[model samples]
Target: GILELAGTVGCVGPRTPIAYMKYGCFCGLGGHGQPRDAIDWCCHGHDCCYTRAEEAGCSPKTERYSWQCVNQSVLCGPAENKCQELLCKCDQEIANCLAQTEYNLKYLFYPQFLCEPDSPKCD
Candidate 1:
């Protein structure tokens, strides 16, 4: 996905104004670059979560790694399974990040190209 930061002077470090910063849009598709702001950092964390889960032998089904998919009653397990917890938290963190972000010209951005090729190997 694309970032659409709405806060100016966005930075990551502390809660003291310039606090630090989800898969957000990419889901699994590969895309790596420095975070434009705290919002963008969420995306990086999401990707890292997915990677960590897999390393822990909790990899999602091929191409079925969405947060919703993992949270299924038949999958997530009672009280949250290790894998489920990781993936669920991964998506949720981003959800909350955006929900709490001030996206009203109070800020800044996420960019794109002229419909660049987005159909390549990821993961």
Candidate 2:
């Protein structure tokens, strides 16, 4: 799990812009070194709504929150579940392919979406 890896590096700070990257491509979008980036790139379009559900107290460990969020958000259309599955798969593939250090360092200085539902940048 990307977040698990992120948690290991203490990258789960709320909306914190990260500048360091001891772990490879795990550093998120904008090279902020946040675990959220993994979801951003890997999950792509559905990350926000999914995150929104999580922030709203939805459990990532279960599908209830995900379905509830998708239903409430109404952004993913009818096949949102399918999209979600694909995104998660994509995340895993990316995680597996990239070496731990595989990331573009230039993005580290930028402030980007931390990849959570409550993030204004995410909306």
Candidate 3:
């Protein structure tokens, strides 16, 4: 089976008191006999791939993957930093007791392994 993850944000305000925003989530819409069906559906039109870190990368579905955020302006910052922040927010929301908001988690198949550029031991 395929594993999927989604991204979301929460705004605690007004009547709702809590608002959850789902960024990118697996559509689960599959075509016949091919994982491409699911991949294509998820990518929509942008570049997408499901290959894991252990395998040779595939010709990306488009050219690059997509990004989602609470606000478009939020991306003025760095990518890894943003991801870390999102993870923190997720943890906080999950730990909150009086909070009415629900945490959103999304996962894309970009298993960035110990490769170049982002390599950890490269220093």
Indicate which candidate wins on TM-score: 1
Please rank every candidate by TM-score, starting with the best. 1, 2, 3
Rate residue 65 of model 2 by lDDT.
11
lDDT of 1 by residue, 1-123 (tens): 112111211222122222222122332244455444455455556567666767887753332232222221112224345765665554455455544554323223223332234422323
CA lDDT of each prediction against the hidden true structure: 0.40, 0.35, 0.24
Clashing pairs in 2: 24-100, 24-101, 28-37
**Deviation from native of the Cα of residue 45 in model 2, angstroms:** 5.8
Off by over 4 Å in 1: 1-28, 60-77, 102-123
Per-candidate TM-scores read 0.44, 0.26, 0.20
Per-residue accuracy of model 2 over 8-85 as CA lDDT, tens digit each:
223322222233332222333322223434433432323444455466554443432121123212121233555454
Worst lDDT run of 10 residues, candidate 3, spans 1-10
Total colliding residue pairs, candidate 2: 3
TM-score of model 1 (CA atoms): 0.44
Candidate 1 vs candidate 2: which has greater TM-score?
1
* Model 3 Cα lDDT, one tens digit per residue, 8-62: 2122211121221112232223112221223222222211223321133322222
Which residue runs does candidate 3 get wrong by more than 4 Å? 1-4, 8-40, 43-48, 52-68, 72-77, 80-123
